[PDB]
UniProtKB/Swiss-Prot annotation:
Lineage, highest ranks first: Eukaryota, Metazoa, Chordata, Craniata, Vertebrata
Phosphothreonine PTM sites in chain numbering: T17
Residues of the full protein shown: 22 to 120 of 147
Highest taxon of source: Eukaryota
Function noted in UniProt: Inhibitor of PPP1CA. Has over 1000-fold higher inhibitory activity when phosphorylated, creating a molecular switch for regulating the phosphorylation status of PPP1CA substrates and smooth muscle contraction.
Organism: Sus scrofa (Pig)
Region described as Inhibitory: 14-99
Modification comment: Phosphorylation of Thr-17 induces a conformation change.
A GO CC annotation given for this chain: cytoplasm
Entry keywords, A to Z: Cytoplasm, Phosphoprotein, Protein phosphatase inhibitor
Entry comment describing in which tissues the protein is expressed: Detected in aorta smooth muscle and bladder.
GO MF annotation terms: protein serine/threonine phosphatase inhibitor activity
Modified residues (Phosphoserine): S5
Protein's name according to its UniProt entry: Protein phosphatase 1 regulatory subunit 14A
Amino acid sequence: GPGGSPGGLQKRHARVTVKYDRRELQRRLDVEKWIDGRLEELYRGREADMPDEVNIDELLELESEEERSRKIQGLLKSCTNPTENFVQELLVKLRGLHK
């Protein structure tokens, strides 16, 4: 399809965020906070901070859901610099809706 694969954002966002649609209370304010700050100092115009999608253990609730951060870490370590803050700020921002 000419425009059936892509949707709202053209896969050109911070990292595996893709706007985790979960709640519109106070989780979106945090998104713009660390998503733009890091991108401003990571890839202001390199289109590399964006991998492709996101981990699944965050919802699978497997016995070792903690692997969700380690997976996205190396998955982005090739592009986004190694920073537990970015990995944690994401999985922690959705600590009220997702796990």
